[model samples]
Target: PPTFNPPVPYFGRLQGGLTARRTIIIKGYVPPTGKSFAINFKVGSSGDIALHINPRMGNGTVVRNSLLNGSWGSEEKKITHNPFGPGQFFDLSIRCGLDRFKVYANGQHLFDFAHRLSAFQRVDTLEIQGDVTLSYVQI
Candidate 1:
């Protein structure tokens, strides 16, 4: 099911958990006043993050990483292009693969983040926060 016009800082459960070929789509517009936003795939309420997709509008980079055991691992910040900006709308999709998460924006492939947690099915929570005005979300 797709949700429309959800408030920012939205945190919800991903039904049926995460699996290969499953894609999470988020459509939103960046505000002209905020510096960044984050999309997180959390394993549980224990604060373990399976994937962290952070888009920084000020520096124009999408930071990707995982939080395990309350510590952040190495970040993946290299991208050919930044698909988000101030006042710009975006169609962002995170596609799950057997080994990695493929991210696309505006129909263009952006980056791939390898799976840090092998048991990705445990990632049942979807968290969105910061400066974006969310218009749609689908899991």
Candidate 2:
């Protein structure tokens, strides 16, 4: 039996907004020829990116950054370590906190990205794209 889920390049809203203890789970895979892929949480009515989780298969590194007022902030490239590889699916979890986002990959602690936006509630949408096909997202 196969697990059924939604397709990628998907844009969905985060009802009630993001808050502490709230975790967003994403199931997806990196193709053998994957170059890069990104998952972004954005402010609903603006082009701001509260958090951008990008994993590059070519470089084997994950970059975390924020885009505000059309300008990008400093990238956070230091994860506890990278967990992505070719031809494998990933269980990525983003857990909300008062100051940072705690991330876990395949049930193991990955890294914590500090909040760039003052009010996290303003981030209302999840935009996912790039070289990976998403199964689905759950909050």
Candidate 3:
């Protein structure tokens, strides 16, 4: 695996058991052929917590593999209240393949997305951007 330095250091002081904010960027041309990779993190927020992936091309599709709460890929997908409470840790993971992406939170697989283009071989960067503390990051 190739590693690239983050353009900016993560900012945000640890508060109420939330201790870090990190963003990891993986840049370069990734061949279309390869095994799937996973991005994992822990989220603990008092207000709201979200894990977002932004593509450079801004062209991508989300596929719903499973449903939680009301329904998958629906308006109810967004959780307003934190069941884990403030400063509680929730394990999160995002699995990315050549044509699909899977999201898992707190040991539960949440959703999946299919790549809009089959030839998504070239990825300039992979960024882990969000509000959270960094215990450690590895790709």
The C-alpha lDDT values of all candidates are 0.89, 0.85, 0.32
| lDDT (Cα, tens digit) per residue for candidate 2, span 28-99 | 888889889898989979879989999998889899999999999998888766777888888999988999
Weakest ten-residue segment in model 2 by summed lDDT? 1-10
Q: Comparing candidate 1 with candidate 2, which one achieves the higher lDDT?
A: 1
RMSD of each: 1.4, 2.6, 16.6
Model 1 Cα lDDT, one tens digit per residue, 12-95: 898788988998999999988979899999987678888999999878889999999989999999888787888899999889
Task: Give per-residue CA lDDT, model 3, range 59-135, as digits (tens).
Answer: 22221222222232322233322212223344445554545655555556555555432332222223344332234
Best by TM-score: 1
Ranking by TM-score, best first? 1, 2, 3
- Judged by lDDT against the true structure, how good is candidate 2? 0.85
Q: Using alpha carbons, what is the TM-score of model 2?
A: 0.92
TM-score of each: 0.95, 0.92, 0.38
Model 3, position 14: C-alpha lDDT score = 24
Best candidate, lDDT: 1
